[PDB]
Every structure is written in C-alpha cells, then in structure tokens.
C-alpha cells in the first residue's frame, strides 16, 4: 500500500484505489497503473521534474528503503506473478530490487521529490509507476 498526497490530489496504484478513490475520481489510467482521487486537506508531497535514473524507494516486505537505478518509463510486459495475471504496462520504470504485493504504492524519490509508486514485482524486478510525467499534479 501507499499513495502519493500533492496538492489536493492522491495519487494510487490504479488496482489498490479504494470506492472512496474511485468516488473521488480525478484520472485514472489502466494502462500505467495510476489513478488519482480529490483529497479535502492539501498533501505535503512534492513531485520531481527530472529524468533522474537513480533514488531511492520503500520496500514495504523488508521494512527498508534501498538505493536503486532505475529504467527510463517505458512500455514493459509484466510477467504473471502468484497474485496478478501477464499484462503490459506503459510510464513504467526498473530496477534490481524486491518487491511483495503490498509493497505497491512505496514511494521511489530522487532529490527533485517522488519520482513514482512501486507498481509490479514477483519476477526479479522491482517496477515503478511514474508520475513525473503528470504536471497538472502541481497546479489547479
Ligand atoms: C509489487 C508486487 C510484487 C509481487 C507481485 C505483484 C506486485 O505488484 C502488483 C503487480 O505486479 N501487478 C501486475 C498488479
Ligand atoms: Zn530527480
């Protein structure tokens, strides 16, 4: 689990969004995993602007975040793990790392601020949700 509070907007891995989320509805994206709901009170996240391929990101299942280098967003095939079926998915980014299923939504950041949300593990490799892409998180 995790979300990422910028502004008045929550940002969650699209399959973890709650009803309220989904009530709340701001974007949603299944193709990246993303889905963004209104909040009342203003987050104290702040989204990196920047093509930074190295940072750091929290791994729920060992209670440790890690410093990774990370793959540029991209369009992979996220093999099937115990819980998920095979799919493709778009502004996903790598890294050598661990991941467990509750581990999705852990924030990945560089010095700019969060760069995304753990959003696919169970195969080796650790993918990253980005939402640096996503400028109009930082405005209306
Ligand atoms: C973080 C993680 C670890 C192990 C299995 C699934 C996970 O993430 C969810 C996922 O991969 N999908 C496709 C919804
Ligand atoms: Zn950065």
């Given at each position: 689990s995790g979300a990422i509070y910028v502004g008045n907007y929550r940002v969650v891995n699209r399959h973890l969004a709650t009803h309220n989320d989904w009530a709340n509805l701001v974007w949603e994206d299944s193709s990246r995993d993303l889905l963004?709901?209104?909040?009342?009170?203003?987050?104290?996240?702040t989204?990196?602007?920047?093509?930074?391929?190295?940072?750091?990101?929290?791994?729920?299942?060992?209670?440790?975040?890690?410093?990774?280098?990370?793959?540029?967003?991209?369009?992979?095939?996220?093999?099937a793990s115990e819980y998920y079926?095979?799919?493709?998915?778009?502004?996903?980014?790598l890294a050598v790392g661990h991941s467990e299923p509750g581990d999705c939504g852990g924030i990945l950041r560089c010095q700019h601020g969060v760069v995304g949300i753990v959003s696919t593990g169970g195969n080796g490799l650790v993918g990253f949700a980005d939402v640096r892409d996503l400028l109009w998180l930082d405005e209306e």
């Amino acid at each position: 689990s995790g979300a990422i509070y910028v502004g008045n907007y929550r940002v969650v891995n699209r399959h973890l969004a709650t009803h309220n989320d989904w009530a709340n509805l701001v974007w949603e994206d299944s193709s990246r995993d993303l889905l963004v709901s209104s909040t009342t009170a203003q987050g104290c996240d702040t989204i990196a602007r920047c093509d930074c391929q190295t940072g750091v990101y929290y791994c729920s299942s060992r209670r440790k975040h890690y410093p990774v280098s990370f793959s540029k967003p991209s369009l992979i095939f996220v093999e099937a793990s115990e819980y998920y079926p095979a799919r493709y998915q778009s502004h996903l980014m790598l890294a050598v790392g661990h991941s467990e299923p509750g581990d999705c939504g852990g924030i990945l950041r560089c010095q700019h601020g969060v760069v995304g949300i753990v959003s696919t593990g169970g195969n080796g490799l650790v993918g990253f949700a980005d939402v640096r892409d996503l400028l109009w998180l930082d405005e209306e």
